[PDB]
Amino acid sequence: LVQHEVLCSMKNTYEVLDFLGRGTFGQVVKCWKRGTNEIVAIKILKNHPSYARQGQIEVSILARLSTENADEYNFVRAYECFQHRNHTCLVFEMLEQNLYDFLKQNKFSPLPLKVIRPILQQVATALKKLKSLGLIHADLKPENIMLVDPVRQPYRVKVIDFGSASHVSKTVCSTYLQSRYYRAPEIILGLPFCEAIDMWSLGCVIAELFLGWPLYPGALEYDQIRYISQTQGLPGEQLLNVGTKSTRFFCKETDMSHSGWRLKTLEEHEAETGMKSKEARKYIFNSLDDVAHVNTVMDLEGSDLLAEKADRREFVSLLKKMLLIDADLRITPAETLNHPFVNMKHLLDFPHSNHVKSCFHIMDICK
């Protein structure tokens, strides 16, 4: 169960100092490595047989990632893995603050695109290495992207929480998987999924950093697929046909001139499940292009505004490619690093803008 005040390792030695967090399963606690000046995070896993298979596969993925010991691809370095009492725990490096707590303390104010760009490049590099190994993170949320040091190393991030990671398999998710606000349509509709469910999650977080609030903050999976379809259009017919959960949110309407699929109205869903659906979006978009026209009051003069408008033009261009409902056509982590928003090739067309001089400056410092 829960423990405190002291801990014991087989090869090293750790003394627990303060609790760090508690999830659905698996507790993380901050401790001090005795004999050194290092602070590390230890994630304990309860020794229940029904959770033993998920606990073992997480250790298998960390050992395969630890071969990439350089971790220049921005991963949390896993040190060792021992067993205390009858439980199995993992030792990670101690990062400072995750992106959600960074937005919370700033009253969820939007972040400029010049700060979003370094974070996007680092996470896309991580997902480029995850596809290189045939792995899925399956839990990419702002709570799982932590800043190494917000003051010493400004805007350097790493990804955490592999408790949902798994190898690529041709198996439909039986129920739910990723976090709801960042869940790909494949998991909602009951479709075969691969590594593209993290490209969808990365689109919902860079949009959350730009707006301050989640892009699709649906309380239920119906609200989630409703916001997506109302903003980006209904999913394709071939996708809704082979979708297992596709019948729980859509219906086969057949008028004289109607097509095949349509959404269940708020009146229909409220009668089917009894739950009245309320609006939770801070931003309602008829199109992803309306994201570029959000929060448009800046101090940028004519020289800098011509570039910020070009910056937003490429941000919604990448965001649309990252939020394509069809996972077969969704942009890949390798292509995202080659998108003009990350290449900054569209900012080169400006002779000397004092804003683009800072945009390029924030990028080459993240090293």
Author numbering: 184 to 550
The authors write:
HIPKs belong to the CMGC group of serine/threonine kinases and are part of the dual-specificity tyrosine phosphorylation-regulated kinase (DYRK) family. DYRKs are named after their characteristic dual-specificity, as they auto-phosphorylate a conserved tyrosine in their activation loop, but phosphorylate substrates on serine and threonine residues. HIPKs are regulators of various signaling pathways and involved in the pathology of cancer, chronic fibrosis, diabetes, and multiple neurodegenerative diseases. Based on a database search, we identified abemaciclib, an FDA-approved Cdk4/Cdk6 inhibitor used for the treatment of metastatic breast cancer, as potent inhibitor of HIPK2, HIPK3, and DYRK1A.
To determine the structure of the human HIPK3 kinase domain, residues 159–562 were expressed in baculovirus infected Sf9 insect cells. Crystals were grown in the presence of ADP and MgCl2 by the hanging drop vapor diffusion method. One HIPK3 monomer forms the asymmetric unit cell of the protein crystal. In the structure, a continuous polypeptide chain from residue 184 to 550 was determined for HIPK3, exhibiting the classical kinase fold as seen, e.g., for Cdk219 with an N-terminal lobe (197–278) and a C-terminal lobe (279-526) including a fully ordered activation segment. For HIPK3 instead, we find that the phosphate group of pY359 forms a 3.0 Å salt bridge with the side chain of R431, which is part of the HIPK specific insert region. The RYYR motif remains at the same position as in DYRKs and HIPK2, yet, R363 is hydrogen-bonded to the carbonyl group of G401 and R366 forms a tight salt bridge (2.6 Å) to E404. Unexpectedly, the structure of HIPK3 adopts an active conformation with a fully accessible ATP-binding site even though the kinase is in its apo-state.
